[PDB]
Symmetry: C3
Subunit: 138 residues, 3 copies
């Protein structure tokens, strides 16, 4: 189906714009790409930020503890699945450039749940991030 | 064409699901995404696994020689080409997380040949993996 | 829209083929994917190559200063935007394999401007590359 394909591109576009905002420190913008009740589980062991204000607050607190740095998130291996929410499985690779060099990792399998807002744009209802280092740790 | 575009997304979805299975150690599942006569040339110098049982066996033997580890394969730079088989050229980046850290590489140009099975889903008839370290080696 | 989606896949296909040519040292081929007046700003601080002959010349001079090596460029996080030119924002990760190992980085945010040539194929009118190490440098 042409619609399935269109949805796939749409999710890629959505995800890209989210990370363009995040990576450039536009935390409000990033939060606005989630539903008003959005769940953001960024780190295993830690409770998710729920809601836009919590996501923005969480990002601010994390930036205060750990940032002269440029982070880039790179998504690959998108697979989507099902009458109005879509699940998205994919891989994230974190890159961090600092004055003393580039760091690669961690790699993170992620599950997103996406819905369509009142204006027809996609919003992220849920982002559930796992860390491969945590998985290996045992 | 909307169909060309749809095919492109379809191949991306197919490839993602293949690697989700592989990376999580679901070797039977991965093998089932190939044709029953599928060719899997994973390593230069070594003969391909041909057929699903050979792919599963090959993966098992490799897991026995070399695996407390989590591997992720990341595909980028997909280009497809032609009345019923499609050729796919792309790049693979291997990531391996172990207790003592993350390894990046090798990078591998790959050619896939894809066909459509009796139920209309894509299957991989052929996967031909080159290694950039082997290429540089001279 | 099915056309928006089709355009997104089209840009991905275009970009992939460009890098397949570049990475394999087919500089003329790469240059032919730009408009005859194409702007290629590969490095901050340095003036862009403008025109196909300048791009080919620039690539030759760079290959002469710095190349037994295999480079791969990996694009992720494509976002496109607008009646006949399209802007494309995305991330590039450079990988370089040499006899003594693999190098990862730099990471480069890039903006492309794409138009359609007389035969309907996409051409790159402009490629503006930023380097995250340059950004961090301050």
């Amino acid at each position: 189906h042409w619609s399935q394909a269109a949805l796939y591109a749409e999710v890629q576009q959505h995800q890209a714009r989210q990370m363009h905002a995040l990576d450039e420190g536009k935390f409000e913008e990033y939060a606005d790409t989630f539903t008003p009740d959005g769940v953001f589980r960024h780190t295993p062991g830690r409770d998710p930020a729920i809601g836009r204000e919590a996501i923005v607050r969480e990002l601010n607190e994390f930036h205060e503890r750990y940032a002269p740095v440029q982070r880039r998130h790179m998504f690959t291996m998108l697979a989507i699945d099902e009458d109005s929410a879509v699940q998205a499985d994919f891989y994230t690779l974190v890159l961090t450039t600092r004055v003393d060099g580039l760091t690669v990792g961690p790699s993170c399998p992620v599950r997103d749940v996406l819905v369509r807002g009142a204006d027809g744009r996609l919003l992220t209802a849920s982002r559930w991030v796992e860390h491969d280092n945590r998985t290996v740790a045992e």
